[PDB]
Design an enzyme around this catalytic site. Structure first.
Site, PDB file in Angstrom:
ATOM      1  N   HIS A 205      -4.145 -12.428   9.638  1.00  0.00           N
ATOM      2  CA  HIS A 205      -5.600 -12.331   9.657  1.00  0.00           C
ATOM      3  C   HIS A 205      -6.247 -13.578   9.053  1.00  0.00           C
ATOM      4  CE1 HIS A 205      -9.200  -9.326   8.997  1.00  0.00           C
ATOM      5  NE2 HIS A 205      -9.515 -10.342   9.780  1.00  0.00           N
TER       6      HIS A 205
ATOM      7  N   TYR B 201       0.968   1.948  -4.027  1.00  0.00           N
ATOM      8  CA  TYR B 201      -0.215   2.815  -4.118  1.00  0.00           C
ATOM      9  C   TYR B 201      -0.005   4.239  -3.564  1.00  0.00           C
ATOM     10  CZ  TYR B 201      -2.947  -1.332  -5.402  1.00  0.00           C
ATOM     11  OH  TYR B 201      -3.445  -2.438  -6.044  1.00  0.00           O
TER      12      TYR B 201
ATOM     13  N   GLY C 223       4.364   1.430  -0.963  1.00  0.00           N
ATOM     14  CA  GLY C 223       5.297   1.474  -2.082  1.00  0.00           C
ATOM     15  C   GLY C 223       4.672   1.499  -3.467  1.00  0.00           C
TER      16      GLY C 223
ATOM     17  N   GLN D 217      -1.433   9.670  -0.326  1.00  0.00           N
ATOM     18  CA  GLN D 217      -2.280  10.314  -1.325  1.00  0.00           C
ATOM     19  C   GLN D 217      -3.771  10.037  -1.097  1.00  0.00           C
ATOM     20  OE1 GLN D 217      -2.421   9.554  -5.762  1.00  0.00           O
ATOM     21  NE2 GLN D 217      -1.232   7.762  -5.123  1.00  0.00           N
TER      22      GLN D 217
ATOM     23  N   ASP E   1       0.824  -1.206   0.000  1.00  0.00           N
ATOM     24  CA  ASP E   1       0.000   0.000   0.000  1.00  0.00           C
ATOM     25  C   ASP E   1       0.862   1.263   0.000  1.00  0.00           C
ATOM     26  OD1 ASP E   1      -2.356  -1.815   1.926  1.00  0.00           O
ATOM     27  OD2 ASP E   1      -2.693  -1.236  -0.108  1.00  0.00           O
TER      28      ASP E   1
ATOM     29  N   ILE F  30      -7.444   2.418   0.948  1.00  0.00           N
ATOM     30  CA  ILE F  30      -6.944   1.773  -0.259  1.00  0.00           C
ATOM     31  C   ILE F  30      -7.955   0.704  -0.661  1.00  0.00           C
ATOM     32  CG2 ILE F  30      -4.954   0.644  -1.333  1.00  0.00           C
ATOM     33  CD1 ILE F  30      -4.173   3.263  -0.048  1.00  0.00           C
TER      34      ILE F  30
ATOM     35  N   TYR G 144      -9.708  -1.563   2.017  1.00  0.00           N
ATOM     36  CA  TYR G 144      -8.951  -1.474   3.259  1.00  0.00           C
ATOM     37  C   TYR G 144      -8.951  -0.062   3.826  1.00  0.00           C
TER      38      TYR G 144
HETATM   39 CU   LIG Z   1      -6.870  -8.306   7.327  1.00  0.00          CU
END
Ligand SMILES: [Cu+2]
Ligand SMILES: [Cu+2]
Ligand code: NA
Ligand code: NA
Ligand SMILES: [Xe]
Ligand SMILES: [Xe]
Ligand SMILES: [Xe]
Ligand SMILES: [Xe]
Ligand SMILES: [Xe]
Ligand SMILES: [Xe]
Ligand SMILES: [Xe]
Ligand SMILES: [Xe]
Ligand SMILES: [Xe]
Ligand SMILES: [Xe]
Ligand SMILES: [Xe]
Ligand SMILES: [Xe]
Ligand SMILES: [Xe]
Ligand SMILES: [Xe]
Lengths: 620, 620
Positions: free
Chosen positions: A584, A294, A292, A298, A290, A371, A374
């Site tokens: 997760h 995306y 590096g 921003q 996320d 993102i 997320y």
């Molecule tokens: Cu997760």
């Protein structure tokens, strides 16, 4: 006047103007990254030179450039054409997100796949996902995104409830071509909605929550000067913001008596990766960097008062460049507030008759980003007692798939037919240390058990041991929770009043690191994630544990290449890189929107001070 | 009307009256312990019988008794003479604390030791410390305390700054004799004061802290009925208090729709031990079972508003027995409040256009106790999302010694000549589980790494495994942080809507367990502390991991004896005992009064609910 001040709208406009004047920002050019560079070591006595680093993409297919501009002097310092097949593709552009769905909507293979599943193309959303590096030779040197489909039944529907499994497509976002459409077979598209604002699903809203009012009638105890310099309860620092890393803390120091004592020169989350553990070919390529790929900064949210940040809040509104070099403000993008933190210290002494209680507080500096599915909150905390802490908060909507008939070893069931692939969220904190200045070293400290025998006749003794990490080759370390392993950063030339080197101790949560097979593509691209702690010798060009260009970039850059230099780190300018993450296995309680879960780390003073630093905190 | 209500002053007075009438509480008798017994399994449909358990000491040297009284019926249920050499001494009486110093003050050996060090006996405080069981055969069957000396320069001086090392004495507190005085040689008594309210040491107090006001203009969201029954945001429980364990939570349940679903039947800290790691004969015997030997509830502080507990606080004032059977109120001894807990859930969805944020809260139930130099806060938390958490907060003044010339592998330096012996603080949480009722089982869950190969060609897959603990012999478990080990308590007969057993997952901090050699006295007396998790079959007489009588009691009782029964725990009424602790190598920042440090654990729902339980939380 501070060389660590936030970038202003005017500075970004000026970079734009300098690039334009230099012939580097014509109509086919787009800014994929722009950020201020930190001042070089030394040059504090010298006049300031605000420099910006820019990655420039070209939509016509020409090679991108890495450019450094001096906005102070109005000049281009350097400009170099990049060979992306070698050094990596530029970060994903926001404008490329929509391109995946748009192109797929008129592709005959995609339409055939959707027709086989009786899905209306107008209702099919496509998540534009980073491609990584796998076995597809034609992708090398090309800007590729991969698309996974989700059905949206109506404009306000949560498409994540309706994953279209068995289908994935690959798209060249520059030439605007669909390179591949893979259909491994139909799965039922889960039918239940996941609309967490629909009264049918929520039921009647609770009326039982009475208000909690947090106010500061005399205002906050911290001051903000020069836009972003914070002073609070002996602490001082500068709050930076970068489009890639998000909130960055500079010059963390503590005023101990008359002396301003540095602790950390620069603190950031320099990378985060979300690797998926489902071996299905539909998702086995899935790893989101996320930071590096995306650029989390921003997508920082504008944070509403009383909802996202509660109490007496002071906001910063950082400015970033859009794709054309125009400044864009992220209104109320950074929250700053202090909060009560329970009891700090307490003792009721029988012999003296003195009862003593003091309360703790922490300074909080945070932002929240989105993102795709997320949403992550990044929180830095400074405590009265000298403790520094980071916490990541993960929420949003879990990434979904079909749940296979007969179950799965790699996917959880959330709802009828609805799966959630197993994954991790792994962060890298880059801590450019400055414990009482730049001459620092790291020791690994373990608890040491002792055997009953001579010198320990009752078998009660226990101890500890410290091992100095002298060179980069011996500074790649793993956790050992069983032996209470921590790492101490000290200054061997700065002693406390007891003649011991001053230090800070890093306390990790000791969560699992990257689980992927060591021979996988992700183990190579996210090598940093395979070990808990790395120490390097500081260098100005060693910014990210994954290197400068992560998108569609193989191994070869980042931390494994940095430490190969095998530099002296025993009493030198060093950088600690701490890997920490959440593993997760989604639960039903995570659906249809996930309650926050957390991970982090902290550093506590370890003989840094000559006694408790909070004896001067007043009562009540 | 609730059989789980707090003991009232009248009930304690009535126990006193029943014992007196029965001939069991004459002038030489003292109550060393008194507490209400929980209702038996079943008997909910039956009429209530409030029963109290009493340990009665005799100051004339006669054998103590264990007594059960029915206060409802005005009868003695049972009374048995105890052989303390076999089953253990009764807990230390508060009246015995002062006896150590008093007796030593006229002892010729003690006076000789103090004179050798030029110390005025009127200025020497003696900490009355539990004796344990070591090599002294004459102590068996006798009530012994050991004394360590600290100089107090004036009435308001902190004696802990001035330890008298090289000297320890043993005292029989019943016969009032000094059994032994050991002087191994003079050490310098550290001279610097540790007076944390003296302006010379604190310097000028900070004037920089602006107020934080936390109020609830409509009052709290929780209700208290029947004195101690709490209802808050779907949760319900009863807050008990016991002189040994402190705050005990009963009948923790969650209202899911129309159904009140049990989760935990009883939660308590059933033991805590503080073992010292200094092999010096002056302290090598030192292990404080604050719960089992001293009774932490009895020393609970009265908590001041705005100092100890901040916000809209509801207090309970539990009643305990004094040494003669008279009721004594601990005014404002338990704090209850709700607090904001940041963001609960958040998502900003591109496709739907819906932005959603909800805030979290937790219910807090706490008390704070003081045992000599040590002060501990015990905090239970219930969260909106179903999470249950415990946190211990350790503060006070560190236990001191001399710091040896030439250093130490087992003692830290705090000030010139002043040492702090290494030690641990280890807790045992006893969780009588009732996940959707009493038919429960425990599984150990580990992350499972997978090898790149057939079925996992990209080497990204990872999984997990669960192992049911079927019998007590296989239910003594250790942590494995590296593999993300947790333990799930489930109900195999109660399934969620996805046909999976409902459960809760215990997340440990994975801190080191007891470090002492396995052949030591402390490893035997605190056997529970050597392993992270134990599961037993419920029995009414298996209350503490160390047994009923810990003081001067060898191994033979407690958890190792309970599990030898090797009972079925696969779908039965079971109890989880979780060991967790802090390993403390004192730092200079801990002196002269220590900033709070914490340890704990939590349990999160794991397919207990059919979806997120917080969809009905309102906005803002
Ligand atoms: Cu997760
Ligand atoms: Cu301690
Ligand atoms: Na450094
Ligand atoms: Na149970
Ligand atoms: Xe190039
Ligand atoms: Xe700060
Ligand atoms: Xe910027
Ligand atoms: Xe720009
Ligand atoms: Xe998206
Ligand atoms: Xe902060
Ligand atoms: Xe997280
Ligand atoms: Xe006895
Ligand atoms: Xe509650
Ligand atoms: Xe009691
Ligand atoms: Xe009593
Ligand atoms: Xe004491
Ligand atoms: Xe609670
Ligand atoms: Xe603790």
């Amino acid at each position: 006047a501070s060389p660590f001040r936030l970038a202003s709208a005017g500075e970004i406009s000026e970079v734009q103007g300098i690039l334009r004047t230099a012939g580097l920002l014509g109509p086919e050019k787009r800014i994929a990254y722009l950020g201020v560079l930190d001042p070089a070591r030394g040059a504090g006595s010298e006049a300031e030179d605000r420099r910006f680093r820019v990655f420039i993409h070209d939509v016509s297919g020409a090679r991108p450039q890495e450019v450094t501009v001096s906005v102070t002097n109005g000049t281009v310092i350097s400009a170099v054409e990049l060979d992306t097949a070698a050094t990596g593709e530029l970060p994903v552009l926001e404008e490329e997100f929509e391109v995946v769905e748009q192109l797929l909507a008129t592709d005959e293979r995609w339409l055939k796949a959707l027709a086989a599943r009786n899905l209306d193309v107008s209702k099919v959303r496509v998540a534009p996902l980073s491609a990584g590096v796998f076995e597809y030779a034609e992708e090398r040197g090309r800007r590729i995104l991969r698309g996974l489909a989700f059905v949206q039944d109506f404009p306000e529907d949560s498409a994540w409830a309706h994953p279209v499994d068995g289908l994935v497509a690959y798209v060249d976002v520059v030439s605007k071509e669909v390179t591949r459409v893979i259909d491994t077979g139909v799965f039922p598209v889960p039918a239940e909605h996941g609309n967490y604002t629909d009264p049918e699903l929520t039921g009647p809203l609770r009326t039982t929550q009475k208000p909690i009012s947090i106010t500061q009638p005399e205002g906050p105890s911290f001051t903000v000067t020069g836009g972003n310099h914070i002073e609070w309860e002996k602490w001082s620092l500068d709050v930076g913001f970068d489009v890639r890393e998000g909130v960055v803390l500079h010059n963390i120091a503590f005023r101990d008596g008359d002396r301003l004592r540095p602790i950390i020169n620069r603190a950031s989350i320099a990378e985060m990766v979300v690797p998926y553990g489902d071996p299905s070919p539909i998702r086995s390529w899935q790893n989101y960097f996320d930071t590096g790929e995306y650029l989390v900064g921003q997508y920082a949210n504008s944070l509403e008062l009383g909802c996202d940040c509660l109490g007496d809040i002071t906001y910063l509104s950082p400015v970033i460049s859009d794709a054309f070099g125009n400044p864009r403000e992220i209104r109320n993008g950074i929250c700053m507030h202090e909060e009560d933190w329970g009891i700090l210290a307490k003792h009721s002494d029988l012999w003296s008759g003195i009862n003593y209680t003091r309360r703790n507080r922490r300074m909080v500096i945070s932002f929240f980003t989105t993102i795709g599915n997320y949403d992550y909150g990044f929180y830095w905390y400074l405590y009265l007692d000298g403790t520094i802490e980071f916490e990541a908060k993960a929420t949003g909507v879990v990434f979904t798939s079909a749940f296979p008939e007969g179950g799965s070893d790699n996917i959880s069931q959330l709802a009828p037919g609805l799966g959630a692939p197993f994954h991790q969220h792994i962060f890298s904190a880059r801590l450019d240390m400055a414990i009482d200045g730049f001459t620092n070293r790291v020791e690994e400290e373990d608890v040491v058990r002792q055997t009953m025998g001579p010198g320990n006749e009752r078998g009660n003794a226990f101890s500890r041991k410290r091992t100095v990490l002298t060179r980069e080759s011996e500074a790649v370390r793993e956790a050992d929770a069983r032996t209470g392993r921590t790492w101490i950063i000290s200054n061997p030339e700065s002693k406390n009043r007891l003649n011991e080197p001053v230090g800070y101790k890093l306390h990790a949560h000791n969560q699992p690191t990257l689980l992927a097979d060591p021979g996988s593509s992700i183990a190579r691209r996210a090598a940093f994630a395979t070990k808990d702690l790395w120490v390097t010798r500081y260098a100005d060009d060693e910014r990210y544990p994954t290197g400068d260009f992560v998108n569609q970039h193989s191994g070869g850059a980042g931390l494994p290449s940095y430490i190969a230099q095998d530099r002296d780190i025993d009493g030198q300018d060093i950088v600690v890189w701490h890997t920490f993450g959440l593993t997760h296995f989604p639960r039903v309680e995570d659906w249809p929107i996930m309650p926050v879960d957390t991970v982090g780390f902290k550093l506590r003073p370890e003989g840094f001070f000559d006694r408790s630093p909070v004896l001067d905190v007043p009562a009540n």
